Design a binder for this molecule. Structure first.
Ligand SMILES: [Br-]
Ligand SMILES: [Br-]
Ligand SMILES: [Cl-]
Ligand SMILES: [Cl-]
Ligand SMILES: [Cl-]
Ligand SMILES: [Cl-]
Ligand SMILES: [Cl-]
Ligand SMILES: [Cl-]
Ligand SMILES: [Cl-]
Ligand SMILES: [Cl-]
Ligand SMILES: [Cl-]
Ligand code: NA
Length: 129
């Protein structure tokens, strides 16, 4: 599914991301925009052979099982395909573990490089929430 901006903002709020670990909704929307352009089905292979999946491009090295990332863990206890669904519950729940692990939203390199410190509230402006 390709979400609209405000549609994903509402979805992320319903699933409890708004101010999760202190990160306002606009940080999460922004991270999704640059990780996946709001497409749940986005996948991208990394150089190390792991793959990033879903609206928040969650990596198979640590977080999910795809059957083809040697030596990896599956900390979210999910197949990586769960992270491609129209229903964002598995991406949200796994993202909540990732953002809790110590480095906050710096786990998403695109969030550090394109969203951190910027006017992230612009991403939810105009939206019914
Ligand atoms: Br939930
Ligand atoms: Br629910
Ligand atoms: Cl947009
Ligand atoms: Cl915000
Ligand atoms: Cl990592
Ligand atoms: Cl393959
Ligand atoms: Cl959903
Ligand atoms: Cl649905
Ligand atoms: Cl933090
Ligand atoms: Cl407005
Ligand atoms: Cl809107
Ligand atoms: Na894995």
């Amino acid at each position: 599914k390709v979400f609209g901006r405000c549609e994903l903002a509402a979805a992320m709020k319903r699933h409890g991301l708004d101010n999760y670990r202190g990160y306002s909704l606009g940080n999460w929307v922004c991270a999704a925009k640059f990780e996946s352009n709001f497409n749940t089905q986005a996948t991208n292979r990394n150089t190390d052979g792991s793959t990033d999946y879903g609206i928040l491009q969650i990596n198979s090295r640590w977080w999910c099982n795809d059957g083809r990332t040697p030596g990896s863990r599956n900390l979210c206890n999910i197949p990586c395909s769960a992270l491609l669904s129209s229903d964002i519950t598995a991406s949200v729940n796994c993202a909540k573990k990732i953002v809790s692990d110590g480095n906050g939203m710096n786990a998403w390199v695109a969030w550090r490089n394109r969203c951190k410190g910027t006017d992230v509230q612009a991403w939810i402006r105009g939206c019914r929430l």
